[PDB]
Design a protein that fits this description.
This is part of a larger assembly, with six copies of chain A (about 160 residues). Chain A has one domain (about 5-150): MS2 Viral Coat Protein, CATH 3.30.380. Helices cover about 15% and strands about 35% of the residues of chain A. Chain A is built from two helices and six strands; from the N terminus they run E-E-E-E-E-E-H-H. The first copy, chain A, has helices spanning about 105-115, 145-150; strands at about 5-10, 15-25, 30-35, 45-55, 60-70, 85-95. Chain A has a six-stranded antiparallel β-sheet with strand order 1-2-3-4-5-6, with no helix packed on it. The termini of chain A are far apart. Chains C and D meet through strand 1, strand 2, strand 4, strand 5 and strand 6 of C and strand 1, strand 2, strand 4, strand 5 and strand 6 of D.
Chain lengths: ~160, ~160, ~160, ~160, ~160, ~160
Amino acid sequence: PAMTNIVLRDDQTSVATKTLIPIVSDGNMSVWRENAANVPIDGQIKLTGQWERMKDGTYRLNAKLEVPVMETAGAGGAYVAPPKVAYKVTASLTLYAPSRSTIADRANAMKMLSAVLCGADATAGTTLSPQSVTGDAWKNSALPFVFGFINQAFPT
Amino acid sequence: PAMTNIVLRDDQTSVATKTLIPIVSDGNMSVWRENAANVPIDGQIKLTGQWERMKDGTYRLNAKLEVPVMETAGAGGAYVAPPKVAYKVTASLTLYAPSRSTIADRANAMKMLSAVLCGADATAGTTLSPQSVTGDAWKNSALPFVFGFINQAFPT
Amino acid sequence: PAMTNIVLRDDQTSVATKTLIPIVSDGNMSVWRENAANVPIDGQIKLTGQWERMKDGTYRLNAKLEVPVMETAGAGGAYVAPPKVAYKVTASLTLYAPSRSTIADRANAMKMLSAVLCGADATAGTTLSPQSVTGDAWKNSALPFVFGFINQAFPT
Amino acid sequence: PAMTNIVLRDDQTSVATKTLIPIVSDGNMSVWRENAANVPIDGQIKLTGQWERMKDGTYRLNAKLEVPVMETAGAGGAYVAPPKVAYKVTASLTLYAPSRSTIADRANAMKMLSAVLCGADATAGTTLSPQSVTGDAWKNSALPFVFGFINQAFPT
Amino acid sequence: PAMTNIVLRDDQTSVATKTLIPIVSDGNMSVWRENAANVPIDGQIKLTGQWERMKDGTYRLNAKLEVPVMETAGAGGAYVAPPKVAYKVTASLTLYAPSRSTIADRANAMKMLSAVLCGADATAGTTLSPQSVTGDAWKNSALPFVFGFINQAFPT
Amino acid sequence: PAMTNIVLRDDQTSVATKTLIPIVSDGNMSVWRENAANVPIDGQIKLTGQWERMKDGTYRLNAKLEVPVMETAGAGGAYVAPPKVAYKVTASLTLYAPSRSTIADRANAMKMLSAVLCGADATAGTTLSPQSVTGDAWKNSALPFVFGFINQAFPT
């Protein structure tokens, strides 16, 4: 498939739209990046999709979303520098699919873990829109793994 | 929070429901497991949520879904072949969040990467339900990252 | 007993309510933490209750309340970092109860030291509400040990 | 401030009053002690308030309540057994306050931890009087941390 | 699942109730303890549930109930004797389940041995309630295995 | 007493009856065995009651129930395979009673651990009949220790 734009929606009070433009098509990876002004290149949101064949025939597929955070949002100026990038929150989905693995196996695994990350709970058929327009819908959610990852408390 | 059951839905032609019963709560990790008949303990669908504080104050949160495939018995051994597992398709979401990170930032990152894993594309607000009742909806999908993970060919 | 929420009241001008949610149930300890947005995880108020058996049979019971302080309260932003956590004020109650110690002994010790920390003075039956709704009631109090710990002057 | 008497109340069925007379004022510490008849000096209820400036500018303030239990005499030694002490239940509140810490912060911490030691629970503003005249009120209490300290089983 | 209290009934003439409160939850071990008045910690009734994976894949599950009998006071020596534990009556159920075992096998084994320990005899359907309010029902019972364990005389 | 038959009931959907006939009575050992059609001797359900006096006077009483699962035929190799036993699920109750123990101690311990293995929970008087005609009653039961032994997941 060809590289396309990737439009995401974050979880602020007012859901803001973020556009990742394709940058580069490499041999084992491909990269999408945000393009926002008065933001250092290091501060743009980055999406790296890479893949490799382990020595045992097993295929490792990594999708890495880096979200940078500047320290104090700055009034952009003609020759004024942006806030130095304070840190990065990183989230990587790794999929290990062995030699004998099949399309059905991979699809099942991906769909079920996606439901988990969208916080399926004891009640069957439960999920939360990752493209939800509801502001603060994820941080306020009490679903086991959404709440778990966000507020850093897994169920025990 | 307390551990609850977790009900997921696979991507077979007729969508099947899988239920993960809570098994154990360790000091740092918690484990849910399916309870299917005629399956060994090591062959059930397993979900492991673990977390550790790195030496730099950065916190690493892992959610690991193991989907096993058990072997099939060929009646040739002069005894019914013992029921063992063939292999495991594994999918682990890892979130690295430093000490300066907040609830707002962790939520932004989780929601955007969930949208990515649900095949967010150039068209804004595009997502595919991971609890979808549409059979084979994921394996047939052409959404960039759903397709790339299912078929081991990311956009390039 | 099961872990429950723990609701405390501080000593500002307007008494503010702080909720500690249970995080983890470990083998020798249990942890409660505040969950407040635009605050680094390191800056949340923490409560760690641990217990161990010394080699001589004596039981050591520690309850540790960590109160972090950020350096300059910051206007939360979409991709704006919180104030880096400036320092921690820590307060630990340690109870040493030997092998021959009894329920009555431990209850007596705990109640009397609690009265001391609530600042019982020469006048009998004297105490100060630790859940007091009166703003600034503790910092302004002149009770020997409340005043002592707060303003860092013990009676001599 | 000047050292005053300190009147506390235990948790017997009929609540008894204990009075701590000031004994000595050292350079860094001060000591109150009970004066009960037929008790050696080392068997009286003792209260020690000491403080030291750590090498990092952080100040450590300790308040230590020792409650002794004297042995009982069995008339078998061919002489009345000498009155000695059996053991000591000790409870020490320690406050670590750094150089950047203020009166507001020390007060917040002390009040909240006092509320904790008085069995603050999920219900807001919950506390048990440490000068309470209700006999056996503490040992019978089911408040989380009162119960946990008295019975050596914290919530888990 | 989560640890709950465990309420048992003994075989005294007037059947008494014992309550085991959870103390700690480890990864491979969970402990319940009784909290009775005027009994040391070591003299309380203890319940230990543990599990381990042997090197051959076979899981070993152990449930260990310790009923202590404390030393009766005795008359004074030099000083009054300290309270100490005389001995412990211990009862451990161990279940060995190899890799190829199923829920059916384990449930069948557990139910049948439970009926055995509840004194199944030649007449079908025979059983004795372990929660029975009938005082001295077990020590008086003549069912082969109950009587055998109690009176240390096995059917021969 | 004299050895009698022992009639047990399993946990199949339709509850089946198993009869253990006495085989042999030794001095410190007695054996019961099932006699089912089309099952080898080693595949029959076995029950072993033994006792021994340790070197410290403490008596050790063991009751061991072996439930074998025989190998399923499988297709022909060179010749038709001979019937053989696949594995054994084993459940052993061991009771340690020191010299100073009495009938009261042993009966109390046995009844309380029997109520435990029959799934006593927080609610008093809780029990599950081990001779119950309710099919699949044990494997479906959620009582902490019954469920724990069955599903190899202990309350934690």
